[PDB]
Amino acid sequence: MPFSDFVLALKDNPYFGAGFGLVGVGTALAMARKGAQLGLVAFRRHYMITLEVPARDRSYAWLLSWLTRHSTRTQHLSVETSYLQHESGRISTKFEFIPSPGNHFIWYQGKWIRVERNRDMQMVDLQTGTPWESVTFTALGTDRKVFFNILEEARALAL
Amino acid sequence: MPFSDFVLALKDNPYFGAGFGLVGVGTALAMARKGAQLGLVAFRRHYMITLEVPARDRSYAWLLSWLTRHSTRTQHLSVETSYLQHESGRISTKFEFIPSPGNHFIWYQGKWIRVERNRDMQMVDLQTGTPWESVTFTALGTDRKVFFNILEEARALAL
């Protein structure tokens, strides 16, 4: 068995040395990527504020209405048509517009808040028969009073 | 341990240098691709207008009917057969045509609008038993009045 033969040959093989160096560089890059992901996670945890509102909760519609009332100039929008045919066939229709799925940026108080109405692409909620949706408000800072004020304003507008 | 030996050898190995250069080029290309995606997202957010109408909302059928009434020369189409057998067996049938799933381009007012009737390939809506469908109107500009006018025209035609 050429155990020592390969060891000595590998020490003087430029190809093997280059391959080992490239493998080490790739491992270092993977470790750096993992460390960057961990650092971003820690930054989000310790210097950012988030509020997640699922579709089941009634604050979803209130927050969407508050958003469309506040940011009047929202280029991307989704429609909600209220259609009801009462007795004697009197059709009543009205178009209500809400922010479209995706990422939206709003300016409340003195902070930039990132609104993300995400519709999970997979499930169908049995209680509604519709895809699972949620809205997430993200902002920089450590004070949660802004989200509480937004929720209170949305509730007041809804009521 | 040959720690310094590999460092000195790697500095004078053409293969290792070429591999490191190729790795750097690949990383730069990946970063450029990510930056291009982010730039396209920002361009869509800040210079384009979108309106998303799900299948559950009743504006879906109204908008499809308005589209097939407006763009009479739509080469790609889908059929909707209304079949009803009243008492005494009087069969009434009528063929209604709507734009087929995919991307359609229409010309409203003085703007080019990209209509996309997409049928999500995955779910089955429990409320209808049919795949989840939605129509998205996309156009260049920052004025949302065009979509409002289209929706009003569709509602007027439907009523």
Residue numbers in the entry:
A (entry chain B), B (entry chain C): 1 to 159
Which lines from the publication concern this structure?
The human AAA-ATPase Bcs1L translocates the fully assembled Rieske iron-sulfur protein (ISP) precursor across the mitochondrial inner membrane, enabling respiratory Complex III assembly. Bcs1L is a membrane-bound oligomer, with each subunit consisting of an N-terminal TM segment, a middle Bcs1-specific domain, and a C-terminal AAA domain that is highly distinct, forming a clade of its own in the broad AAA protein family. Here, we captured Bcs1L conformations by cryo-EM during active ATP hydrolysis in the presence or absence of ISP substrate. In contrast to the threading mechanism widely employed by AAA proteins in substrate translocation, subunits of Bcs1L alternate uniformly between ATP and ADP conformations without detectable intermediates that have different, co-existing nucleotide states, indicating that the subunits act in concert.
The quality of the density for the bound ADP was further enhanced in the map with applied C7 symmetry in the final refinement and reconstruction. In the ADP state, the first 11 residues at the N-terminus (residues M1 to K11) form a 3-turn short helix, which lies parallel to the surface of MIM and is connected by a short loop to the 50 Å long, 9-turn TM helix (residues P14 to Y47) that spans the MIM (left). This N-terminal assembly consisting of the 3-turn short helix, the connecting loop, and the beginning (14PYF16) of the long TM helix makes contacts with their counterparts of neighboring subunits to form a seal on the IMS side of the membrane, hereafter referring to as IMS-Seal (left). The IMS-Seal in the ADP state features a narrow opening of ~9 Å in diameter, which is constructed by the side chains of Y15 pointing up and towards the center. In the apo/ADP states, the membrane basket in MIM is separated from the matrix cavity by the Matrix-seal that is parallel to the membrane plane. This seal is formed by the β-sheet I, protruding towards the center, with the central seal loops tightly packed together (bottom).
